[model samples]
Target: AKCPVAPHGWPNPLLPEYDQLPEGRPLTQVTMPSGSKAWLVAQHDHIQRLLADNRFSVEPHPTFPIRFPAPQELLDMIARDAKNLLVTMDPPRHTRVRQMALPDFTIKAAEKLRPRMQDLIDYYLDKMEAEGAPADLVQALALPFPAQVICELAGIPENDREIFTRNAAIMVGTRHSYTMEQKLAANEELMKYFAALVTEKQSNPTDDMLGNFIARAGKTDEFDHHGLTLMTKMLLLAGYEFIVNRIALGIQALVENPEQLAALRADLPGLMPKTVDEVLRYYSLVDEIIARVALEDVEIDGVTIKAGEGILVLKGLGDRDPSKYPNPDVFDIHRDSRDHLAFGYGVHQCLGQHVARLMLEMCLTSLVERFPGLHLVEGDEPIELIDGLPPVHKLTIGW
Candidate 1:
């Protein structure tokens, strides 16, 4: 079957019409080709309920679909220990993994990484300036900084970063479809590549996230080979995917609204944080909060959702709701907009948010400071913000 499109009631770009639906009303009924029904809950109350309620669990295999592009060996490796990581677990396991890694992503830890993040940003900005102005920001700065930071945190060698990032890109399939056919192929290539890197890390340990994993593994049988590989890939995918889209979309926002760009340039430290939130809300990169399946038949908002149903919580829809913020259409840094589902909710809330936030703040601050007069190149250079997925491709800009 063709991949699903954003539901009909979903607004243009999926961010603009969030508030159009009445509060407490079900956004809409989205039907799958198989005749299973799931409600797109956009209202704050209902989405929170779905996230917080203990009855919903990620334990069952059907709760999360595992897509791959490789032979069974490679596929089994990841799926077998996926529960070792937070995203694929529920309750105790989820709590355990999240608790283990939370400190690494805490505000204080992210703050320490800020100086390094700025250095990375500065290095890329210098490269962009040397190469030429009006370059693709995603390739130049936005994409690379987070990759470098994640690599440093993970303890992967910078020399091996190219292969690591390539595997991550294919795995996330930001531009391509994250389908079974594609995922299997991608996983084969990734596993082969990671095998070599894993050996290298085992021989010559460095201080990084992977190194931490190795250090922690000595005392416990929990962090096995498969688990280590999954965590490394997950961190890279999460770190890179979010920033990649942010660069493309953040630039689009600045190009469209010059005044806000100016305001950011004037007081970066003060406004940059809000700009990140606005960009997150404005573009709302994640299409659905991955794939979440129901664990049991449960009634929500007057709808009886059966167990084993594939339910997608449309996060961008909530970001776009007008009822939540006046003039949701406008991208205002000062807007009283918070509580967006962009980073998700509950135990599965984005662990790298602090890191993601730092990268965004650094990138936005760098661009406004460096290119005070940056603007989109005029002509028919239209940006394709594809529906049902994060904004991919490019938004060409020039001074």
Candidate 2:
């Protein structure tokens, strides 16, 4: 089976195309590793049905054999003990895990952290100011803000950020500098580091996310050492990665559309939230929804997927479908951009949306306010965007 290719340098090709499906077709027939081909739906209505209907689940197929490097013991540990995090579970189990962690990501909790996020933003800006302006946005802001926030949440020492940041970069598919073995090694090292930090929080806890999860252990049977460890690890990965990229991508969108940027700068309170939504709509930071397997035969949009077939929901593709949004290609910040699957839908919507939205709101609002004249740095031609990732990495901005 040939691996399905995205239609030509998707998400960030220099000759980016949008607003309509390519000349080939609306949905394509692609063979899977199991020698079965499921209809790939790029059409908006079909994708929405795929996402909204409970008939299709995000759980990996039970009978399907996928290869991985983890030992049987480690695999068993992941399956049997580690709560399956949120992405890998279905129904009651998914509901339970989501319920446990959702409160920490509420609007109130996000509001509580606004000052902290603002201070962190200012802190990074100061660091950038001292080191240099027009610094690489990813290194200075896109990477560090979430790194700091996650470290603070995990109750880990800020000093240890370098190791986690470096490893997390690979985990996020930044450089792909590490081999599979090296990546696995990095995961093991991270587990050890986070485990030690969790133990510390066990003894002298603070009002942080890790502390809160640790506090849940005695009260509920749902959280054990394995589950707790995975939750901590998941928080480390999901908590900040999405937020960081959304911020960077939001800025990139604004840079590309100076009129929208000017409008947002003028009435940030009214405009910036919509701008963030537009960012998620236009350049979704996540390439695809995490993979899912069908539990039962489900028919969506005239396509029947068997119970055992693996399903990949191309979220970014879905967002751009013309059927979903009016004039989907236009970068209008105020375009009632409510239907994006950027945070996903149904049982597995991003648990940390509150935090992500707040952090982005603060970052965009404050940056525009603090540096009224800020714009993308000159001579920064040919900004290279990552394929299937957010539009960032070479964003050189100046005031």
Candidate 3:
């Protein structure tokens, strides 16, 4: 099947290729790689309404918009495993899981984690500084930063950190990145490792997120050892890649737009919360990955979507909708991009958003303040693109 999503351009998201779709409408019909048709919901308003409405569901079943990269046996196992996640759930189940999980991810809980997050940031920076200037930012910091933070949150000890990163690379890779056997092995051992760790936490709960989640959820299905493992697995996997991508993309955005970077530096501490949102909005990463299947027939924006239909909440398109923001293409740090659908919207919104914000705010501010001459180090190789995101894999930068 043809990939109908518009060609991706980093930092600045491309508007929908409107000429191919019906001119007046925000919705379009596209053939997804699942070998099926799905509605590509593009307008900011319609995507918002679709995400908020209960008639649409987040479950990934057969006929869902994704093209499964693995064989049926592995895909089935993955699908079954995915059912335990908060994002994959609907209604009462989603409510139950999210409500149980929300406290740990709250601004307050995220605030509690700031010291560690800051330490991780500074630790990485210290290494970069010690090693010398023009460091490969992606390798030196972007990749390791989120991995360490998630480890801190999940109670992975210093010794096991290597194991986590090693397997995660295989586990998180695209189909071409790893073989089915490699994926299966990573999935198997990762689960076993988590299951064992959950048991350990049951006996000795620490102050970290997984430990606190255990203490609070002791009475809770969301707290069932297996349940907690799955939740943690989802947390472990779901949040990292975005942070890694954004660290590169966000810096690139600010650097490329000198006025915006200057504005941010002028008031470093005060403006980052807004700046983070703008980075997210401007990049608008992850389009169809945040897909939904219609639970039933529903009328949204005067159009009726039938049951079992897949909806690609094209955030890249929605974030650029002209009606929502003037000069939607511009990456303005001062703009109120809070309501942009980058981290998604409503109850099914991203669980780690507050944590993500804290990291982005700290990392960006520190990079600007500490490395007064921070600038991208030009390279001979083209920037790498994966899943429509141009993550600068070996991004070199000098102070």
Candidate 4:
């Protein structure tokens, strides 16, 4: 059977019908893109339990289910340096490193950066206005603003952003555009750049997150240069893609649902935060946020997952689970989606969420405020999905 695409549009991949089994048995078998069979956990409660349980691990071992048919080069790259990457690490190490990075991403810290974030938002919106109407919102505002914010926060030099973003794009882009070799080359380039940056920061630390990480690493024996470099790379990769897509996707959602858009514009200050949450829930952007391998035999919902079996916690499906969310299909901004699993739950919840929310709030609010009459360009092609994820490659909008 083929993977399901969303009924509403091209970008959102729908949960397969088999996975959406009856309430008593939400876990079902499916063949992954890699041709490996795994258990798909569809219910919100099961997904939460799987993520929180130590019995399910994130480490990429032989038995781990590869989300895609990743080429041998990428697999080898992961195998050789798996421990260095923050996302693939198990607890105690994951816990420790996460704690070291926590201070920078706290809600208070994000709040402090709001003024600067708004400044960047204004700067980009100004550029968009100067460019005039019928502009590609993705290029003008969605991509650059968050990229700039994250690069600045990470202490990455402004001069190197072009090379950095270009390579990062190839590594993150869909399979059709670049070969595995090219992706692997881009990965190596980024790793080398980050490694050099870590070395430089160690000698003359600046006042940013990367600098603080280096300074903190010097005081502790738990992490070394390689681990630090990998963590930085992970942050850059994670920070860029989601926010970029969400900015474009969020606007697309609002334009598509004009009633919601008007509701938001009527009271931007009051409705912005809840609207952002609804956007996150409505467009659960990435499908691979919560993949795990069973560490031991575990029984849930009267079914047994044998040791070494793979499990995929369908977060998008979980967000739409009718049991937890009433009228789950509708995109209602007023709904209390605070409990949504748009960010993964448990030990690996997104560390940069506060910053992400701050950026989105500023970006979306500024766009709506600046272009009160904003509407999508008529007769253009519908939004396209690249490798089952929406990129909003050319979103031409007019006031």
- Residue-level lDDT tens digits of model 3 in 1-399: 212232233332344333345654468767765577678777899888888888877776666766344577876876876667787888887886676667888999889988888888899999999998979777777778888888888889999998887677666455655788989998889999989988888899887777776666676545466777887788777877777768877887777778878878888766787889888887673433468877788787667777757887767767877788777777778888888788888778889989888888888988988987888777555766666565324457887
**Which ten residues in a row are the worst by lDDT in model 2?**
1-10
lDDT of 1 by residue, 1-399 (tens): 221123211223433224334554465655654445555566655666777766676654533333223455765665677665667788776776666567677888888888888788888888888897668665776556766887778766678788666655555544333566766777887766665555667778755655655555535666667676666566556557667777667877776777888787778777777888888876663354445667777787677767766555657655666567566656788786567667878878888888787777778777777886788774665444456433444445666
Better model by TM-score: candidate 1 vs candidate 4: 4
- Per-residue CA lDDT of candidate 2, range 94-212, in tens? 78667766677788887888777888899988887688666767677777788777776676776888887777766654443357777788889888887787778777877787787
| Candidate that scores best on TM-score | 4
Note the Cα lDDT for every prediction shown.
0.65, 0.67, 0.75, 0.77
Kindly provide the TM-score of model 1 when superposed on the true structure, using C-alpha atoms.
0.80
Please name the candidate that would achieve the greatest lDDT relative to the true structure: 4
TM-score of each: 0.80, 0.83, 0.85, 0.88
Model 2: residues with Cα > 4 Å off, grouped in runs:
1-29, 62-83, 176-185, 378-392
What lDDT tens digits, residue by residue, belong to model 4 across residues 1-399? 222235343344444543445654468876667666578886889988888898878887777887667788888888778787678888988888777778888999888888878887888888888888888787788877777777777788879987877786676555654678999998999889999988888888888876776687678886677877887887667767777778887888789889989999998877898989988887672444478888899898878988868887778877877788787777778888888888788898998899889888888888988898899885666556666665434567888
Write the number of the candidate with greater lDDT, choosing between 3 and 4.
Answer: 4
Greater lDDT among 2 and 4 belongs to 4
Model 2, TM vs. native = 0.83
